[PDB]
């Protein structure tokens, strides 16, 4: 099914699958640590519903058993949320656009402790995408790579199917870069630069899980969200 796809159809299929940009309940009538965090986790919970249905549209994902679909999503859900936040924040230097009505700088991420550090990391990733001038067609490829890769080695011929699809996404990225007029040397370099960022996104997700499980105990908050966590517990 997924092995069929034109490099151009791969892009357009991913572009069509893109989830919408949701709004928060942010009322600018200042917030507190509990209220600001309440907005963020409320927004993440609603985004999860769309991410699940977006994942079904990712080529090759439906060909996977339901047991492995759950596993790949349990491992990558926060990575996927972060790269999307970082993506829609590219044009807002020093700010994270959590929602069109929720644009925050690092000084307001101080409202929660330790969030300042994750904030700077998310800003640095966004600045890196701006420096590289990441294209939307490249972004949807990276996000689908995270979904299929982040869990691939926590999981026989089903793996080779995932790696076959991953190879095709890699072919797509190269196809885009060669179409942008990059030399063959520049294509390989850019491909490497994009994939090394996924290592930092994994790092932000790991630290994000810690900050998250911490306040599952601190007890200032969603059923689907509390259930995504225990998988990383």
């Amino acid at each position: 099914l997924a092995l069929s796809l034109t490099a151009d159809q791969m892009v357009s299929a991913l572009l069509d699958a893109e989830p919408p940009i949701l709004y928060s309940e942010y009322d600018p009538t200042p917030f507190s640590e509990a209220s600001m965090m309440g907005l963020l986790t409320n927004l993440a919970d609603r985004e999860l519903v769309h991410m699940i249905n977006w994942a079904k549209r990712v080529p090759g994902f439906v060909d996977l058993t339901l047991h492995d679909q759950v596993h790949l999503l349990e491992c990558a859900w926060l990575e996927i949320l972060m790269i999307g936040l970082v993506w829609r924040s590219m044009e807002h230097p020093g700010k994270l656009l959590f929602a069109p009505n929720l644009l925050l700088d690092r000084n307001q991420g101080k409202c929660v402790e330790g969030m300042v550090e994750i904030f700077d990391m998310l800003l640095a990733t966004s600045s890196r995408f701006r420096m590289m001038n990441l294209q939307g067609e490249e972004f949807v490829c990276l996000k689908s790579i995270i979904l299929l890769n982040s869990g691939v080695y926590t999981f026989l011929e089903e793996k080779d199917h995932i790696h076959r699809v991953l190879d095709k996404i890699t072919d797509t990225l190269i196809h885009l870069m060669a179409k942008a007029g990059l030399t063959l040397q520049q294509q390989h370099q850019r491909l490497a630069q994009l994939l090394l960022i996924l290592s930092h996104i994994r790092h932000m997700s790991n630290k994000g899980m810690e900050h998250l499980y911490s306040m599952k105990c601190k007890n200032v908050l969603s059923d689907l969200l509390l259930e995504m966590l225990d998988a990383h517990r």
Binding site: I52, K56, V70, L73, E74, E227, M228
Partner: peptide, 9 residues
């Protein structure tokens, strides 16, 4: 398992 359900459709 909520995620299992939302994937089941």
């Amino acid at each position: 398992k909520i995620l299992h359900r939302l994937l089941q459709d």
